[PDB]
Paper text:
We previously selected artificial binders to the αβ tubulin heterodimer (tubulin) from a library of designed ankyrin repeat proteins (DARPins). Here we applied cycles of randomization alternately with selection steps in order to identify higher affinity binders. This strategy led to evolved DARPins that bind tubulin two orders of magnitude stronger than the parental one, resulting in complexes with subnanomolar dissociation constant. Biochemical and structural characterizations demonstrated that the affinity increase is coupled with the destabilization of the ankyrin C-terminal capping motif (C-cap) of the DARPin, which in the parent DARPin interacts with tubulin but needs to undergo a rotation to avoid a clash. This remarkable order-to-disorder transition illustrates a new mechanism for affinity maturation.
We wanted to characterize the affinity maturation process further and selected for this purpose A-C2, the DARPin variant which gives the highest signal in the ELISA conditions. Therefore, we also determined the structure of the evolved DARPin A-C2 in complex with tubulin. The comparison of this structure with that of tubulin-D1 indicated that the structure of the complex did not change much with respect to the DARPin considered (root mean square deviation (r.m.s.d.) between tubulin−D1 and tubulin−A-C2: 0.62 Å (967 Cαs compared)). Actually, the main difference between the two complexes is that in tubulin−A-C2 the two C-terminal helices forming the C-cap motif were not defined in the structure, as in uncomplexed TM-3. Taken together, these results indicate that a destabilized C-cap is a characteristic of the evolved DARPins that contributes to the higher affinity for tubulin.
Residue numbers in the entry:
A (entry chain B): 1 to 42, 45 to 278, 285 to 360, 369 to 441
B (entry chain A): 1 to 37, 47 to 437
C (entry chain F): 13 to 142
Write the structure that this text describes.
């Protein structure tokens, strides 16, 4: 039945996860009590992918809410859709992770991990045919980063034949909670490279840049940044949630989007960039523009290994095809010649809320190395001076673990460079 | 009796199967419930109640496509045991279709095939419908073809294979699945009819004036061609009366078993009253590359065999006069060791179309089946795409993680290289 | 050992302990095994009051550890603006180069500490020369 199990960990993970649920519930016609009130049968056709059927024609998100900080329970439960979640799916600790990856991965997180897995098991066992897991988290904190990656590795050992998909929020000094963010993110990337099938790189640096460019914000709130995350999350899951020409799940997406196992970090994009009707050529140009990417990398500095594009709304499907082929013909140098027909387009008749037409971009680009280089350079600046190292070693971590994570991220950067320079011999 | 069992594997196989059985019912006068107000007994079994049941098996690794058959217009035509579904698909991965996922349903599928075979008194063999591109269409078909060669050693096996096209919803790994299935099926198939999605797309756009053809539009055209090929097995003519004859008439060299099908006329139902096309006009159209099922240049190739299958108001002397003109005005080069003659079949029933469909009802139609070395161009297109990706080992990890050895990609490509050489050797 | 105690107090931000140890003869310029002084530690960990107290009682503003790191490099790396301004005012070498070839400006820029980048440039930080 192609069910997905959704997990949200830490402060960022729960904030973006709640916004995803509010946005997709609106699209599917599901109110906060779990009742359906829409006008289309297409809204309920694939409802089972994200929602469990409850008593008396009600729908309940297949969602697990995790945090080491107790205050997260309260904020979610007080949100507009707070009541929609199953109360026994809230797995919360009391001490917090103090923005420390080691606390999330080895201490507080290791103590709560079994309780989460019991909830994951209960949801998984009730699925007719589990597609896989979707995890929302930041890489810059302690819980989403440390505990999220511990959870991923434990799920990978218990469900080895199921897809692991993440929506991973990359830290930026432009939007920063602490200077230990490069350590937390590097330690996490190392885990993501090995244990996830596909990761959507949601870069806080790119979110800040979009908000500055579009709303002239030098001081955006997490609400401003999250508007872009929820629009993107809705767009990238369109073909999982809605009936259409496409007969596909997360594995089929991973198969066609990931040519090399480690190179599974996507650069998401979105058009039009609104705030809290464009023509098909305008949507297409905007979708391929550096200014519309949710990862702070210039696509023009690399090459696309693979591209997926999802158009939503009533538009000329002939115009979409012509526009997509035009991008590939006129700008052949930005796509690898050794993966034939590596740009795929899908069209969904249903547009998102407050928009008549939209386009969602999913790029597997070698330019993503710029994001990893940025984190690596900040990691190295901090690690060379051993600043804050006792926070991690005090939790039992060894300095070699830092050196190893550093080397693996640099190996990932060199792998992207190798394919960027590869020729179709 | 001389029964033929049709097997539809994966989405493309099942959907084309739907269009074929819809058209067979209309041709034979069978209603969607199996009732009829017999030469067609080769394809349809008959119950005590007078219900005509297709000798068909439908297999898919995920249930969505077959569920539409189970609840649609023809829900009472097939018995539930003939419609087999798994829970998880092959996710465009040949290795999942063949190894990991396929191994879980193979025995059940063979058990269901055996139940149909037991109802036969003179089983000729099988007609296998599948895509080259899908993980199920590629992987599961090759596993089933391997098992059918062991379990039914003397039986003929023919294929109707959907060849991938960028204009028609292809996927990036489809050139791999195509080469993988071709390699493993080659020694288990007697004759295979490739259907290039781009050729069908081109015909629908050019002749039916459909800008963006749906799977329904494409499949109604494919079923019209498939029916033209299987008519001889369902109406008891004088040409291609048994599955064995397809090999005898079209395949002098066993590995070179891919005949080019050319069909005419394809006319829009929504176009102004036109004077009906003569035998000479529809025959001339058989040598027009635009009417081929597979895109290739036959002037670059040599003919090994050629069959012309007419349907409707077709006088034998008019066919003989049309063929005489073709040996004069046109340059049809046969290989120095082949008879040079054209084999002719005529079925006098007026051609049948789906009521309200895109195709106009015609007085006379023709399907030419020619074994030409020009079809090697379609193998070269797939091989080039395979080569680009394989040189970098792009996507190979997905296959290796699903019970397949990496060496199988090299063994498959070497076999394709030998097949391209077989064509080149015959072509001179 | 008073030296070890003052290094710990400056790192932990124990304002009262720092003043008590210094009254007992604690070496204001004591070093740990890596060459870090109480001023390096107070500058890294954002203890402004301790930075000011150490500077008033003989702390070397431009002391180098074994890797050539000065308190200014560390304050600029971690992003402590007020500490950066206090060190500069007390004569910290704005263009000090550590073993990796980094200056305080380079560290502030890599870590995205824009206000510190501005403050360093205003106090004569040389961008084109290390
Ligand atoms: N002509 C035609 N081609 C089709 C149809 N459905 C799919 N295809 C083609 O078949 C290929 C995809 O293979 P599928 O048959 O859909 O997939 P599958 O065999 O079910 O296998 P998996 O989904 O990978 O498990 C592409 O090249 C499609 O264009 C159809 O109804 N008609
Ligand atoms: C469940 O959602 C999706 C699933 C898939 C695809 C996709 O992008 C259009 C999706 O939407 C984001 C997909 C992606 C990329 C491909 O090539 C790069 C491809 O060959 C093929 C595809 C898909 N197939 C087709 C014909 O589009 C199958 C997998
Ligand atoms: N985009 C976005 N980033 C957030 C949000 N909340 C926190 N962050 C980022 O997440 C990182 C801090 O991790 P956080 O999730 O608060 O910590 P955790 O609770 O220990 O996982 C920093 O990079 C923050 O900028 C949010 O709602 N949206
Ligand atoms: Mg399928």
């Amino acid at each position: 039945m192609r069910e997905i199990v959704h997990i949200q960990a830490g402060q960022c993970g729960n904030q973006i996860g709640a916004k995803f649920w509010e946005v997709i519930s609106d699209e599917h016609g599901i109110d906060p009590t779990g009742s359906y009130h829409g006008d289309s049968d297409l809204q309920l056709e694939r409802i089972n992918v994200y929602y469990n059927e409850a008593t008396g024609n009600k729908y309940v998100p297949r969602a697990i809410l995790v945090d080491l900080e107790p205050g997260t329970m309260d904020s979610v439960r007080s949100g507009p859709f707070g009541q929609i979640f199953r109360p026994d799916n809230f797995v919360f600790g009391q001490s917090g992770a103090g923005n420390n990856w080691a606390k999330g991965h080895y201490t507080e997180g290791a103590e709560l991990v079994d309780s989460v897995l019991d909830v994951v098991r209960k949801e998984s066992e009730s699925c007719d045919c589990l597609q896989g897991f979707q995890l929302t988290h930041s890489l810059g904190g302690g819980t989403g980063s440390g505990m999220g990656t511990l959870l991923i590795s434990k799920i990978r050992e218990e469900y080895p034949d199921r897809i692991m998909n993440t929506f991973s929020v990359m830290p930026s000094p432009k939007v920063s909670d602490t200077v230990v963010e490069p350590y937390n993110a590097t330690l996490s990337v190392h885990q993501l490279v090995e244990n996830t099938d596909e990761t959507y790189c949601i870069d806080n640096e790119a979110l800040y840049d979009i908000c500055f460019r579009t709303l002239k914000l030098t001081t955006p709130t997490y609400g401003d940044l999250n508007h872009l995350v929820s629009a993107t999350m809705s767009g990238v899951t369109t073909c999982l949630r809605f009936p259409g020409q496409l007969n596909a799940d997360l594995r089929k997406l991973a198969v066609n989007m990931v040519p090399f196992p480690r190179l599974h970090f996507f650069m998401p994009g979105f058009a039009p960039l609104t705030s809290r009707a464009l023509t098909v050529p305008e949507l297409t140009q905007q979708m391929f523009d550096s200014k519309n990417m949710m990862a702070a990398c210039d696509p023009r500095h690399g090459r696309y290994l693979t591209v997926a594009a999802i158009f939503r709304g009533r538009m000329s499907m002939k115009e979409v095809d012509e526009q997509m082929l035009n991008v590939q013909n006129k700008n052949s140098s930005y796509f690898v010649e050794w993966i034939p027909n590596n740009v795929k387009t899908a069209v969904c008749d249903i547009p998102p809320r407050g928009l008549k037409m939209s386009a969602t971009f999913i790029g597997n680009s070698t330019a993503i190395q710029e994001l990893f280089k940025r984190i690596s350079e900040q990691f190295t600046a901090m690690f060379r001076r051993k600043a804050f190292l006792h926070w991690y070693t005090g939790e039992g971590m060894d300095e070699m673990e830092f050196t190893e994570a550093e080397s693996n991220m640099n190996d990932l950067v060199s792998e992207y460079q190798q394919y960027q320079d590869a020729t179709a011999d | 009796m001389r029964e033929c069992i049709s097997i539809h594997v994966g989405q493309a196989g099942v959907q084309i199967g739907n269009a074929c059985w819809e058209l067979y019912c209309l041709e034979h006068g069978i209603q969607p419930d199996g009732q009829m107000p017999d030469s067609f007994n080769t394809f349809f079994s008959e119950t005590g109640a007078g219900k005509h049941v297709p000798r068909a098996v439908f297999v898919d690794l995920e249930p969505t496509v077959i569920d539409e058959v189970r609840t649609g217009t023809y829900r009472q035509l097939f018995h539930p045991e003939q419609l087999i579904t798994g829970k998880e698909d092959a996710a465009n991965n040949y290795a999942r279709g063949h190894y990991t996922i396929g191994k879980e349903i193979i025995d059940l599928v063979l058990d269901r095939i055996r139940k149909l075979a037991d109802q036969c008194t003179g089983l000729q063999g099988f007609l296998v419908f599948h895509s080259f591109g899908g993980g199920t269409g590629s992987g599961f078909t090759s596993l089933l073809m391997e098992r059918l060669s062991v379990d039914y050693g003397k039986k003929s096996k023919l294929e109707f294979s959907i060849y991938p096209a960028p204009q028609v919803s292809t996927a990036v790994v489809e050139p791999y699945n195509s080469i993988l299935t071709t390699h493993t099926t080659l020694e288990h198939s007697d004759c295979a009819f490739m259907v290039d999605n781009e050729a069908i797309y081109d015909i629908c756009r050019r002749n039916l004036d459909i800008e963006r053809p749906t799977y329904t539009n494409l499949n109604r055209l494919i079923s019209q061609i498939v029916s033209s090929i299987t008519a001889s097995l369902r109406f008891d003519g004088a040409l291609n009366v048994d599955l064995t004859e397809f090999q005898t008439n079209l395949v002098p060299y066993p590995r070179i078993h891919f005949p080019l099908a050319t069909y005419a006329p394809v006319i829009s139902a929504e176009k102004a009253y036109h004077e009906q096309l003569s035998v000479a006009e529809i025959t001339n159209a058989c040598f027009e590359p635009a009417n081929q099922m597979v895109k290739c240049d036959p002037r670059h190739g040599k003919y090994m065999a050629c069959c012309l299958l007419y349907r409707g108001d077709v006088v034998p002397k008019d066919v003989n006069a049309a063929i005489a003109t073709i040996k004069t005005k046109r340059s049809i080069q046969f290989v120095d060791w082949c008879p040079t003659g054209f084999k002719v079949g005529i079925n006098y029933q007026p051609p049948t179309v789906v009521p309200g469909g895109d195709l106009a009802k015609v007085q006379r139609a023709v399907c030419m089946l020619s074994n030409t070395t020009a079809i090697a161009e379609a193998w070269a297109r797939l091989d080039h795409k395979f080569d680009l990706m394989y040189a970098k080992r792009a996507f190979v990890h997905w296959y290796v993680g699903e019970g397949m050895e990496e060496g199988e990609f090299s063994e498959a490509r070497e076999d394709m290289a030998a097949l391209e050489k077989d064509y080149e050797e015959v072509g001179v | 050992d008073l030296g070890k105690k003052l290094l710990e107090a400056a790192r932990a931000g124990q304002d009262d302990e720092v003043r008590v140890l210094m009254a007992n003869g604690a070496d204001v310029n004591a070093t740990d095994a890596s060459g870090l002084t109480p001023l390096h530690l107070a500058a890294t960990y954002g203890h402004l009051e301790i930075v000011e107290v150490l500077l008033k009682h003989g702390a070397d503003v431009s002391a180098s550890d074994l890797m050539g790191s000065t308190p200014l490099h560390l304050a600029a790396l971690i992003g402590h603006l007020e500490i950066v301004e206090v060190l500069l005012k007390h004569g910290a070498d704005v263009n000090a180069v550590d073993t990796w070839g980094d200056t305080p400006l380079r560290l502030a820029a890599v870590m995205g500490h824009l206000k510190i980048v501005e403050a360093l440039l205003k106090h004569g930080a040389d961008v084109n020369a290390q």
